[PDB]
Amino acid sequence: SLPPAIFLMGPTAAGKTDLAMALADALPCELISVDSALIYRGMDIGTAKPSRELLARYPHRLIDIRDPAESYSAAEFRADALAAMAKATARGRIPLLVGGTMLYYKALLEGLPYTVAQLAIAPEQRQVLHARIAQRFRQMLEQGFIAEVEALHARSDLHAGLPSIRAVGYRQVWDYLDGKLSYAEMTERGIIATRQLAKRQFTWLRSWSHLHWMDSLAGDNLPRALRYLKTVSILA
Ligand SMILES: [Cl-]
Ligand SMILES: [Mg+2]
């Protein structure tokens, strides 16, 4: 028999982290982040990383595990995720992998000794997701996104071409700091970059099988999610 596992994916800004925390309060879960950007320390505001307080009450594996000067491959994610899942399983906890880095999920499924239930969340209308993406980005700037990048920009061991700086929006803020862009251009292009990411994620998701879709605007996703576990033959 194979131990249970949950995958919670979807495009950026869909509210995945929100639902993960809810599920974490209904079942004994072990939150595991599947995000090539959240792995970096010092990149919290621009990455929409859960606050230090929220992480305290909802611990996430694979968050803040690398310095921005370091690289992280899908191969390393695979090994770390398998380790975290086995560790949670041994404790009777249900591995709950939440995030939108499809390349990571792919490496795990292909290159799994688990009976996986796969959940996905997003708005029915992409226009709803787009508006939130623009608003969320503008708020990041208000909460100190620029100051956050200034600290990275000041490091001689970091440059704009690094893997870490590929996290959406960071390069635009970096260029702004280089005096190459106006505040307006930095904002518009960071939003475009993020909208572009969602587009790439949707492409991956539309071709993915065994996905139980949920609506970001729905108010009862918890009960709906808890109900699906049985469909995939998982008794929890
Ligand atoms: Cl994220
Ligand atoms: Mg999130």
UniProtKB/Swiss-Prot annotation:
UniProt binding sites for substrate: 12-17
Pfam families associated with the record: IPPT (PF01715)
InterPro entries (UniProt xref):
Dimethylallyltransferase (IPR039657), IPT (IPR018022), P-loop_NTPase (IPR027417)
| Keyword terms of this UniProt record | ATP-binding, Magnesium, Nucleotide-binding, Transferase, tRNA processing
Q: Please list the reactions this protein catalyses.
A: adenosine(37) in tRNA + dimethylallyl diphosphate = N(6)-dimethylallyladenosine(37) in tRNA + diphosphate
User: Record-annotated residues binding ATP?
Assistant: 10-17
Tell me the domain of life.
Answer: Bacteria
State whether keyword Transferase applies.
Answer: yes
Q: EC number(s) on record?
A: 2.5.1.75
One record GO biological process: tRNA modification
Q: Which residues does the UniProt site feature Interaction with substrate tRNA point to?
A: 101
Q: Which GO terms describe its molecular function?
A: ATP binding; tRNA dimethylallyltransferase activity
* Residue segments, region Interaction with substrate tRNA: 35-38, 166-171, 199-206
Q: Which cofactor does it need?
A: Mg(2+)
Q: Report quaternary structure and partners.
A: Monomer.
Give the similarity note: Belongs to the IPP transferase family.
Q: Function of this protein? A: Catalyzes the transfer of a dimethylallyl group onto the adenine at position 37 in tRNAs that read codons beginning with uridine, leading to the formation of N6-(dimethylallyl)adenosine (i(6)A).
Q: Please state what the protein is called.
A: tRNA dimethylallyltransferase
Specify the species: Pseudomonas aeruginosa (strain ATCC 15692 / DSM 22644 / CIP 104116 / JCM 14847 / LMG 12228 / 1C / PRS 101 / PAO1)
State the organism's lineage.
Bacteria, Pseudomonadati, Pseudomonadota, Gammaproteobacteria, Pseudomonadales
Q: Which gene encodes it?
A: miaA
